[PDB]
Amino acid sequence: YFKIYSKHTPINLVRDLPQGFSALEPLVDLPIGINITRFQTLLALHRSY
Amino acid sequence: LTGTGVLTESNKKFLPFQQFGRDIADTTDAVRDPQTLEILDITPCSFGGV
């Protein structure tokens, strides 16, 4: 069971994420059961001219 | 859920993912209607000693 949680909260600090408490509601349960051991972050770059 | 009780229309705020609800420890007091979206409230009906 792939429990995905998300909580979009606005903030005015750029770095050094502030303290406090927040909740995380389950988004959607994904059907899983395969073997996963390595997570890879995939970002997006903005090619200019 | 299964059993006996009073089904009332409370004002609890049930989140979309939430389905059931307990009170203190494994005592269900409010559920969600399977067909519709309205929120019920399972309340134990009148009891007491004579």
Ligand SMILES: *[C@@H]1O[C@H](CO)[C@@H](O)[C@H](O)[C@H]1NC(C)=O
């Ligand atoms: C998943 O694959 C890795 C890769 O070698 C292995 O070490 C691990 O035991 C595997 N886990 C399961 C549950 O198959």
Ligand SMILES: *[C@@H]1O[C@H](CO)[C@@H](O)[C@H](O)[C@H]1NC(C)=O
């Ligand atoms: C389920 O069926 C009942 C039958 O009248 C209907 O009132 C209700 O709106 C239906 N629920 C959904 C989610 O379609």
